[PDB]
Amino acid sequence: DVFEVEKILDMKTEGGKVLYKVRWKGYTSDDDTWEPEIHLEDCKEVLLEFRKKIAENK
Amino acid sequence: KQTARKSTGGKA
């Protein structure tokens, strides 16, 4: 079942696939999960915010 | 609002 995403915290690759670390709205870091990029079609804006942030810091 | 499936399983 589906939940609200507060933000994207980080990203990584494993096994040739990209995953993103999600802060779930209304929960704390103890509940943070890694999610396959495929699960995140409805997280356009939070993904972009994250990507821009990473780009800013380089 | 931003939404997604939460993974409750994973590597064992």
Residue numbers in the entry:
A (entry chain A): 57 to 114
B (entry chain E): 4 to 15
Paper passage:
M-phase phosphoprotein 8 (MPP8) was initially identified to be a component of the RanBPM-containing large protein complex, and has recently been shown to bind to methylated H3K9 both in vivo and in vitro. MPP8 binding to methylated H3K9 is suggested to recruit the H3K9 methyltransferases GLP and ESET, and DNA methyltransferase 3A to the promoter of the E-cadherin gene, mediating the E-cadherin gene silencing and promote tumor cell motility and invasion. MPP8 contains a chromodomain in its N-terminus, which is used to bind the methylated H3K9. Here, we reported the crystal structures of human MPP8 (hMPP8) chromodomain both in free form and in complex with the trimethylated histone H3 lysine 9 (H3K9me3) peptide (residue 1–15).
To explore how the hMPP8 chromodomain selectively binds the methyl-K9-containing histone H3 tail, we determined the crystal structure of the hMPP8 chromodomain in complex with the H3K9me3 peptide. Two histone H3K9me3 peptides bind to the opposite faces of the hMPP8 chromodomain homodimer, respectively. Structural comparison of the hMPP8 chromodomain-H3K9me3 peptide complex and the free hMPP8 chromodomain identified a newly formed β strand (named β1) by the N-terminal residues, which exited as a loop in the free hMPP8 chromodomain structure. This β strand is induced by the contact with the H3 tail peptide, which was observed in the structures of Drosophila HP1 and Polycomb chromodomain in complex with methyllysine histone peptides before. From the complex structure we can see that the H3K9me3 peptide binds to hMPP8 chromodomain in a cleft between the N-terminal newly formed β1 strand and the loop connecting β4 and αA. Similar to the structure of the Drosophila HP1 and Polycomb chromodomain in complex with methyllysine histone peptides, the interactions between hMPP8 chromodomain and H3K9me3 largely involve the main chains of both the protein and the peptide, including the residues Gln5, Thr6, Ala7, and Arg8 of the H3 tail and the residues Val58, Phe59, Glu60, and Val61 located at the β1 strand in hMPP8 chromodomain. In addition, the residues of Gln5 and Arg8 form van der waals contacts with the residues of 98–100 located in the loop connecting β4 and αA, whereas Gln5 and Ser10 form hydrogen-bonds with residues of Glu101, Val102 and Glu91, respectively. As demonstrated in most complex structures of methyllysine peptides and their recognition modules, the trimethylated K9 lies in a hydrophobic pocket formed by three aromatic residues, Phe59, Trp80, and Tyr83. And the trimethyl-K9 is anchored by cation-π and van der Waals interactions within this aromatic cage. The distanance between the two aromatic cages binding methylated H3K9 in hMpp8 chromodomain homodimer is measured to be 40 Å, so it would be reasonable to speculate that hMPP8 chromodomain dimer may bind two methylated H3K9 from the same nucleosome or spatially adjacent nucleosomes.
